[PDB]
Structures are given as structure tokens and as C-alpha cells.
Write a protein that binds this DNA or RNA. Structure first.
Ligand SMILES: OC[C@H]1O[C@H](O[C@H]2[C@H](O)[C@@H](O)[C@@H](O)O[C@@H]2CO)[C@H](O)[C@@H](O)[C@@H]1O
Ligand SMILES: OC[C@H]1O[C@H](O[C@H]2[C@H](O)[C@@H](O)[C@@H](O)O[C@@H]2CO)[C@H](O)[C@@H](O)[C@@H]1O
Lengths: 437, 437
DNA sequence: TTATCACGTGATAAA
DNA sequence: TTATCACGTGATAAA
């Protein structure tokens, strides 16, 4: 898709309140005539850097702030320049999450953190430590239930356990993140992931469990605990499960440290609708009535708008979310974040399946998370170099074929030409190419 | 995942009644103690041939019959051997759809065909031809609505229009399909796709429209028509849209010819649960109460079970489905079907976007749909041949380097060794490798 | 059918 | 950093 003047197309993840955001777009259209289409395509955070490099893509893209710095480095986002009065409507730290190289690159919407979700009926007293989960599962298995199921395919859900005992992504020193200092391979990281793998080896968890599998098992009352964000609450509300949201369990006496995301909206740098997107975001979405329509669909978490967050903060589920977010850290937005997430995703999946041990999976993840992505020109230098190496050799064999009179067969590879050249220079070449004078 | 003795894991597409099928699995577990997990992973029809080749994968896989012959050729499915009395409970033609090389390779469940779905309130008199859709869109656009939106990303939804004027997939002659005779590049195929592209060029349809985009626009009353199967009816029931299901529009005075699918269940050839899967499928799912629980979730279409289909056939939506299925054809199940679907998917997307003209997109699709997939041994013959070609050359240069005394530099590519060999034989080599005596 | 060379990125390493 | 050779499949074609 290409965006056109006069219409607004929005991308937002399929687990967010896209139907509520479409209501906000319908009110926008009612007051300005600008149609607003909300879409939730799969892997949007991956498709956007591909399509936006040539002017394609949506007008607005919704994602956690950790992806936007990579978008900004590639020149895909329009600089966000809201009035000082509007910046004051949002919490400063939410603005910090969308500041890259001194510039605001997106509008912050909501603060998201994973928490522990548990079935009050099956488990009135949720556990406080990770270590007492294997025993808890033994009790529930005798009843036909399981202790805990959560998404093992995305390292977002596993990172709180990895980070508890000291595992970290990029070290922050003296005002900046050091991208060569990755801490996914330390003792704290190995201890957390080994406990995860140990849960699978002892049949307390399934390596293939994914989002929908874990969501269904909890919402059907088959498992007593899940780990998820505020977006998942509305599906449990409609189910018959009476649930609570509380602090994540400790590991080795240390709190789980979830990576905190700030759902943000960036404007495509190629959109002839920048003013309309700025108007819709500032005056329609980032208002009480606008965030309410989205929040009633799928809860947003702790919204960046002060006026509406003073209402939402009364929800004890939001207070638990903040409790977990205080125990965690706001994610970096640096372009390296995507390479960090891929490497950890592979490390968690490979160790949970048994394809790799914990030590080997994390050692390679540390190398990958710090691997410098080669520039386009570097790739091009290599391609041209090998193209030139072949062209020189091709010319040589072209000259030997046309001028050697080498008593060649009708069809032969250039190796047979090279062999003929060797005997002419006084060499002996055997069949496997062994050569001597 | 690997399957284990005593439990049943099922894969079914995410647009089908997986929650209803889970109810059937829960009743199974109640009467036998065998837990049954229903999962709907993305692209299951693609993951199954990958994971099942090494013993992984689910116990049972649900898909339209067109994929199963390729699974059977790869040896991934257990032969289905139901008693004669049970075969008689299902319509013979549904059994034919799952017969490959004389053997039954799956249990048939339901017959699916696309129909025309329309909003009765916005459009009480649905159109009968494709040709009158562009004018109909002009009327609805002035009201703020659109005429027709359907999935343009999957060629299943576009094939009825391609096949109307004479386009076909594989020709059937003398009792068999000829896999070298592909008819996606004839005048009938070009005419149907050109009309599709013409709908996009004249702004009546969007090239990027996908399933969820089309489903939402119809279920929100923004478009007057969509093309979908019976699985989509329950989402429109919960919406406020008053809809009807009728025959697909004609093109060039000829009926649209949808490819008819038979939702089938195959048993993994690597499952130590074959008897349990056979028991669950025959005595729990393929019963009235079992198909009812699934059908109440997402409608199945015209079920293969005679006793329950005599009930469902009274539904006028099912009668329209059958009306369309009679105008279409049962899909082949031959292994080439997957290569046919990929080629047409690329042809439709490339022409709808403008990356390729209709003529070029269909010409390449015909070549691809008939392209013989090279055997593993053929791939291996090529790999070894090039490995051997490099090994011979490597030895030669190894001998020249160690015995030439060629006045070489410290580091040089093998091209510089070859150059030195040329002057020793009496040649002149320039820098670009131009050589002569 | 088999065959040759192209092709761009990977594995490895000198510096 | 740049450098070399490996690597398996693609483009092309003789037969
Ligand atoms: O798992 C890697 C993934 O983690 C985070 O993604 C979250 C997202 O922030 C949430 O809003 C929600 O959608 O769950 C996602 C995990 O599936 C990072 O934001 C993302 O960049 C990263 O790839
Ligand atoms: O579009 C190619 C696709 O068409 C059919 O898939 C259908 C399927 O049969 C229906 O049950 C439903 O899920 O919609 C699908 C299209 O998205 C073929 O069965 C399938 O093999 C083919 O790839």
C-alpha cells in the first residue's frame, strides 16, 4: 500500500484495541471527512521498515517504543513537534521513551508491563517465587490442571525471568547504552533460562506453548497462572474465570524484571497526511474520550495522558502493572534492539526444545545481539569484488579457449582448460587435480 | 512438538470452529481419559509437511482435501481404514475427495464453497453479474460505502472469477489429471483477472485487501458485498448486519466456478495414537452431536455425515453454498496442487499491485504451476558436482602455489597464481584478464 | 536428462 | 577493516 492525501491508514498490533481505535477514527471522519482505516497486519513491526523505505506503508504505525529508534535511523518517521502545552499533558518519562538523538519520533500512548495473572478459584493464594512452581504443578496435575502457561515463542514473556538474577540486554553507562556490552550470557541470564528449561524437562511446561495456546488454557480454566499484559484482560473478563493480577514471582530471591514498553504512534515520513495524523493523534486519540474508546476494547495499561491515567490508576490491576514496571526497566529504543530480540528469541526456543544447551544458546545469542549489521555499501563491496574476481578468470579462460589449440573435447569445464594449461607449462595433473612439476 | 502416546493433539485452521472441536475433545477425555488439545497455528498446512517428515507434528491435522495427496506422497499420513458400515455414513463423493492412489488418506468432514454475501439493508437486490459491480460501487461511494471487498491475498477467493470464462488449473482427461496441462494462462483466465485488475485501477477495490480487512468492512456495514465461506457466517450473526447468502455473480454470462474444498482430517503417520485418533474421529467428531458442537462455533458447510447434513441442508445459506459448489469443481488432491496455489497467488498479487501486467503474471504462473519440483537426489547431485569442481581446482592451485616458485606476493588470490601460470606457458595476461599468446 | 558458470552471502583470517 | 575461497542453488543450454 501507498498512502494518499486525504485519508488515514493506521497499523496497530492485533492484540490491541483496534476496534476501539476504529471508533476514534470514525469520529474523526465525522468531524473532518477524513476516512480512517485501522488495520492489524501480521508482523507489522517487520513489514513497516521494508515497505516504508520506498514510500509505501501506513500513515501511522502503533508499536512499543523499542522499535522506533531503528525506524528513525533509517529515516522512516516524521519528527514529532507537538506544542509545549500538549507535551505537558503526558508524563515526561513517556516522552523520554520516544526521544531518539534529541528528537521526538512518536507520540506515547500507554505504558505496558507484564504481570502475573492467576485463577483465584483454582489458586486463591498465588505463589511468590518461581522456585515453588514445580511443586505447585504437581498438586494441580493430580486435579487435571497445570500450574503456569505463557508464551515461550516470544522472548518478551521470558525476559523477566532471565533478567531477575542479573541478565541484561545492553549496559547503560554514563548516559548511554553500550551496544557492544550485551549481558544475555552472564550467570544471571544462564540461571534464569536454566530454570525455564528445567520446567520443560520436568514436564511442567511445553516448549511449543505460544500465545494463543496459553491464552486459551487460562481462559478455559485449565491452567492456574499465566504471564501477560493488560491487553489480555478483556478476554478473561468475558470468560468465566475469576482472576487476579499481581506481582511476578521472584527468582533466587530477586524480583522478576520485565522490559517495560511504551505503546507509541509514529507518523510515516512519506505521508502527505502529517498534519491530519498529528491532528487525529493529539486532539482525538490522546484525549480522555479517545483513550476510553480504545481502553474499553482492549485495556491499554498506564496511559501516557495524565488526565485519564488519574482515572485508570484506581484499577488495582493497573497498580499491579505499575508495581511490576517499577521492578523492571524501560526498554531501549536504539536500532540494535531488533537484533537483540531476534538473538534472544532463538536462544529461548533452541534451549526449550533441546536443539541447544543453555550455555550454547546464550553464548551465540550474545554474539548475535552485538553483531554489527553490515551496511548496504559493505554488502555491495563484497558483491562487486566477487563479480570482478569471476570476470578476470572468465577472460583468461576465454583467451585460452580461443588461442590455446589445447586438444580439448567438444564440451569441457574450465578445469579441463586449466589442466591443459598446466601440461603446456610442464606440469602433471592427476584426476583429482593433484599437480606437480 | 512431538506427539506422545495417550494424548491427542489436533491442528485446525484458525478460521474454523476450534473452540467447538475442543468441546468434542473434552467429552472424549471425559469418556476415555485421553486429553485432547486443539491448536490453530498459523500456516499449519505449510508447517505440517516440514515437521512431520521427522516424526514431529500433531496427531490429527485438519485442512481442505487438496493438500493431503502431497502429504500422502511424502508418507506423512496413516492410511484410513474405516469399516464399510462407517464409510456408508458419509457421502461417497466426500470419500472420493480423500482417495489418493486407491487409498483413503483422511476422514472427510464438510464440503465448503464460496458464495456471495451481501448486506440486505444496504443492497436488497444483489447483482447477478460481475460487470455491473463498477457501476454499483459508484452509487455506494456517494453514500460513503463500497460495493465489494474480499480477500485478494489468497487466490482461493479470486479463482471463481478466473475460472468463469474458461480458466482451469489442471486438465482432467481419461480418468486423471494431466499435470503438464495447466490452464491459468488461457483467454478465460486472462479475462477474469483483467476484470479484477480493472476493478482496482478504477478504484473500486484495494490491492491490499486481505481477509481481516474485508471481514471487518462487511461486518461493520461499510461494504455491501463480500465473498467468503460458511465459516464466516457466525461473525456476521453477532454483528448488526442483516445479510443474505446467494449465488456468485456471473462473468461474461458464465457462472463463477469456485474450487470446492472438503475439510478433512488426516492422522499423522508417526502417531502412536492412531487407534485413539480413529476412535475420536469416527465415534465422537463424525456424529450429530460432535459436528453440532463444531458447527455452532463456526459453520462447517455441507457436512459429510448424511444424518446431520439432512438437518443442515434445510438452511437456505447451505442451499446457496451447494448451488455454488455445483457450479464449481471439487479440487484435485494431487501433490502438484501446492505448486499451483503458490503460482496463482503470486500472479494475482503481482497484477493487482501493478508489479506485473496480467499477461506476464499469468504466463509465469503457468510455468511455475507445472514446474517439476527437483528431487532431493537431484539437488544433491548438483551440490556434489559443484563441490567436486571446486575440489579439483583447489588442488591444482595448491600444487602451483607449493611448487611453482612463481614470484608471488605474500597474499594473492588464485587468479594471480593462474596469471603466473599463463606467462610460464608463454601467455600475456592484462589486468582485466585479457589473454593471448 | 546432465552440464557449466553465475550469483551473492557465509566461513574464516591477516592485519 | 579488507581479503579469499566455500557454498548451494539459479540461469542457461546441449542433447
Ligand atoms: O518478544 C519480542 C518482542 O517483545 C516486545 O513485544 C511485545 C509488545 O511490546 C507488546 O505490546 C505485546 O504485543 O507483546 C509483544 C511480544 O509478543 C517488543 O516490543 C518487540 O519489539 C519485540 O520484538
Ligand atoms: O488460497 C489458496 C488456498 O485455497 C484453499 O484454502 C482455503 C481453505 O480451503 C478454506 O477452508 C479457508 O480456510 O480458506 C482458505 C483460503 O485462505 C486451499 O484449500 C488451500 O490449499 C490453498 O492454499
Amino acid at each position: 500500500m501507498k498512502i494518499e492525501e486525504g485519508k488515514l491508514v493506521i497499523w496497530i498490533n492485533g492484540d490491541k484495541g483496534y476496534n476501539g481505535l476504529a471508533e476514534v477514527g470514525k469520529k474523526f471522519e465525522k468531524d473532518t471527512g477524513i476516512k480512517v482505516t485501522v488495520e492489524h497486519p501480521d508482523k507489522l513491526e517487520e513489514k513497516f521498515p521494508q515497505v516504508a523505505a520506498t514510500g509505501d506503508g501506513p500513515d501511522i504505525i502503533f508499536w512499543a517504543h523499542d522499535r522506533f529508534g531503528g525506524y528513525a535511523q533509517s529515516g522512516l518517521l516524521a519528527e514529532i513537534t507537538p506544542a509545549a502545552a500538549f507535551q505537558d499533558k503526558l508524563y515526561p518519562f513517556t516522552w523520554d521513551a520516544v526521544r531518539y538523538n534529541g528528537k521526538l519520533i512518536a507520540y506515547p500512548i500507554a505504558v505496558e508491563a507484564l504481570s502475573l495473572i492467576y485463577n483465584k478459584d483454582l489458586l486463591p493464594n498465588p505463589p511468590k517465587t518461581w522456585e515453588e512452581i514445580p511443586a505447585l504443578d504437581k498438586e494441580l496435575k493430580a486435579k487435571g490442571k497445570s500450574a503456569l502457561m505463557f508464551n515461550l515463542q516470544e522472548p518478551y514473556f521470558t525476559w523477566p525471568l532471565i533478567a531477575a538474577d542479573g541478565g541484561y540486554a545492553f549496559k547503560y553507562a554514563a548516559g548511554k547504552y553500550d551496544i557492544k556490552d550485551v549481558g544475555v550470557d552472564n550467570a544471571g541470564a544462564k540461571a534464569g533460562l536454566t530454570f525455564l528449561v528445567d520446567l520443560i524437562k520436568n514436564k511442567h511446561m511445553n516448549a511449543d506453548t505460544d500465545y494463543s495456546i496459553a491464552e486459551a488454557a487460562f481462559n478455559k480454566g485449565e491452567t492456574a497462572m499465566t504471564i501477560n499484559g493488560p491487553w489480555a484482560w478483556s478476554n478473561i473478563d468475558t470468560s468465566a474465570v475469576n482472576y487476579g493480577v499481581t506481582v511476578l514471582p521472584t527468582f533466587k530471591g530477586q524480583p522478576s524484571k520485565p522490559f517495560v514498553g511504551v505503546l507509541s504512534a509514529g507518523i510515516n515520513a512519506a505521508s502527505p497526511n502529517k498534519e491530519l495524523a498529528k491532528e487525529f493523534l493529539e486532539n482525538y486519540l490522546l484525549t480522555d474520550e479517545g483513550l476510553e474508546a480504545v481502553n474499553k476494547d482492549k485495556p491499554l495499561g498506564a496511559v501516557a495522558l495524565k488526565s485519564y491515567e488519574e482515572e485508570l490508576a484506581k484499577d488495582p490491576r493497573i497498580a499491579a502493572t505499575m508495581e511490576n514496571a517499577q521492578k523492571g526497566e524501560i526498554m531501549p529504543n536504539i536500532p540494535q534492539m531488533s537484533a537483540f530480540w531476534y538473538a534472544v528469541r532463538t536462544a529461548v526456543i533452541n534451549a526449550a526444545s533441546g536443539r541447544q544447551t543453555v550455555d550454547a544458546a546464550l553464548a551465540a545469542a550474545q554474539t548475535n545481539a552485538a553483531r554489527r549489521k553490515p551496511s548496504w555499501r559493505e554488502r555491495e563491496n563484497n558483491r562487486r569484488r566477487e563479480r570482478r574476481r569471476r570476470a578476470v578468470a572468465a577472460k583468461i579462460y576465454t583467451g585460452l579457449r580461443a588461442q590455446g589449440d589445447y586438444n580439448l573435447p567438444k564440451h569441457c569445464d574450465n578445469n579441463e582448460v586449466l589442466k591443459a594449461l598446466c601440461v603446456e607449462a610442464g606440469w602433471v595433473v592427476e584426476e583429482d587435480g593433484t599437480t606437480y612439476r
